Design a protein around this ligand. Structure first.
Ligand code: 40Z
Length: 208
């Protein structure tokens, strides 16, 4: 069963702004994805200190960057804490609503799109380069879910039947036709070196 949900007006407004505003410094999407992955890894690492059984779903704490030219997709995989069904549908929406208002107020005041991360809505920068974003996630206390949106005011949530992840999050970016540069090995390496060189987890860039 595939469940369809409407984004709250502010999120839909944020998504429309990211997709249609003229902004050339699109590369910042990768640092935002890597930062969310890093925070998710920090959370599971901290929780494992008081409860070691939280690592039974996987001991390895890492980030994988997987480009695919045939499918025109860039996948960001982490072995972080993951997200529950409540996180995907309710919990993060509330946070993102206030985050959007403050960000859109800051943009009106002269701030730029690269500052999106400071408002906790950095995830939505994925729409600078992607026409569709798929989020496969597995949290210890819940099942494996697939969140998906091509914007247009709606998102879907379904129980994932694909390859079991153990624990973590997979962000599949179905890239826009003119954004294929983010599939090039030399381009990804350059972005990682410039914006994410001090991330405290191994970042493995897969080759084709
Ligand atoms: C905000 C936001 C949002 C999403 N993420 C965030 C930022 C915080 N966070 C997790 C969190 C904090 C508290 C509870 O859960 C995320 C972690 C990851 C990750 N790599 O583990 C990823 Cl891909 C996206 C998100 C994803 C969404 C599809 C649910 C939409 C959204 O609105």
């Amino acid at each position: 069963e595939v469940e369809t949900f409407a984004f709250q007006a502010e999120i839909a407004q944020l998504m429309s702004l990211i997709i249609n505003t003229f902004y050339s410094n699109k590369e910042i999407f990768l640092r935002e994805l890597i930062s969310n992955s890093s925070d998710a890894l920090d959370k599971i690492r901290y929780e494992s200190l008081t409860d070691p059984s939280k690592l039974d779903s996987g001991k390895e704490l890492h980030i994988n960057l997987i480009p695919n030219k045939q499918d025109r997709t860039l996948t960001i995989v982490d072995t972080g804490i993951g997200m529950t069904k409540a996180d995907l549908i309710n919990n993060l929406g509330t946070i993102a609503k206030s985050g959007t208002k403050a960000f859109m107020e800051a943009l009106q005041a002269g701030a730029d799109i690269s500052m999106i991360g400071q408002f906790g809505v950095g995830f939505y920068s994925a729409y600078l380069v992607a026409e569709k974003v798929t989020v496969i996630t597995k949290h210890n206390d819940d099942e494996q879910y697939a969140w998906e949106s091509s914007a247009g005011g709606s998102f879907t949530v379904r129980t994932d039947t694909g390859e079991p992840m153990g624990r973590g999050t997979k962000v599949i970016l179905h890239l826009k036709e003119d954004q294929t540069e983010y599939l090039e090995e030399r381009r990804i390496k350059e972005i990682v070196k410039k914006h994410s060189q001090f991330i405290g987890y191994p970042i493995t860039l897969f080759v084709e």
